[PDB]
């Protein structure tokens, strides 16, 4: 809950500043705040199985309808499984309990579908290096609204992908930063406090208000 509370305080602070009514948006850029991980792809098959996704390192995961999670590392071999009760286990495609067979199969189908048919969000973004403190995160929560899909990762990052104009936000409450991908697929990363200081355009402002609403929802559930 601490990640989301932080993010809520950060966003509330920036938004209360009315950053589009001030402009020096480029002064808010902090190139060292680029995220390590985001969701590059997703498939909502919640009608049947659940939500499959791919992170920018090409690792993949599924959050199944039964609230368990299966994660495949980008080595294409190592698996992490998380029961509904939180119990984690570590396995491989090569060595796994019979009980996981089905889910492993489903994960591979998701992988196929995503690899062949979908483009990568942030294809033009080199992710931050990242070190021993940043292990592979998994999808902790997700939902879709009238306007966007909201993806909350276990490292606290919250990603919001807007349906109409393909614009996207990746918020990190550890770095206190936001990456904005616009309709040109240009991306910039800002320190939220610096956005409080120098302000920003109307589009980013609006999307950060919507983001604050989404974080309140995530905190609410």
């Amino acid at each position: 809950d601490c990640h989301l509370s932080d993010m809520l305080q950060q966003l509330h602070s920036v938004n209360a500043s009315k950053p589009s009514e001030r402009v020096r948006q480029e002064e808010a850029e902090d190139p060292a705040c680029i995220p390590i991980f985001w969701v590059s792809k997703w498939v909502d098959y919640s009608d049947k199985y659940g939500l499959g996704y791919q992170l920018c390192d090409n690792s993949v995961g599924v959050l199944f309808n039964d609230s368990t999670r299966l994660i495949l590392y980008n080595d294409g071999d190592s698996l992490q499984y998380i029961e509904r009760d939180g119990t984690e286990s570590y396995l491989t495609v090569s060595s796994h309990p019979n009980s996981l067979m089905k889910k492993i199969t489903l994960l591979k189908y998701f992988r196929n579908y995503m690899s062949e048919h979908l483009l990568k969000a942030g294809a033009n973004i080199t992710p931050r290096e990242g070190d021993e403190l940043a292990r592979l995160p998994y999808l902790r929560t997700w939902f879709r609204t009238r306007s966007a899909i909201i993806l909350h990762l276990s490292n606290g990052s919250v990603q919001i992908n807007f349906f109409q104009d393909h614009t996207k936000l990746i918020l990190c409450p550890l770095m206190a930063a936001v990456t904005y991908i616009d309709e040109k697929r240009d991306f910039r990363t800002y320190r939220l406090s610096l956005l409080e200081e120098y302000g920003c355009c109307k589009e980013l402002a609006s999307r950060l208000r919507y983001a604050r609403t989404m974080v309140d929802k995530l905190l609410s559930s």
């Binding site: 792809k41 498939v43 995503m114 979908l118 483009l119 899909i149």
Partner: peptide
């Protein structure tokens, strides 16, 4: 109402 993220 997309089934998935932005396709190729």
């Amino acid at each position: 109402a997309a089934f998935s993220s932005t396709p190729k």
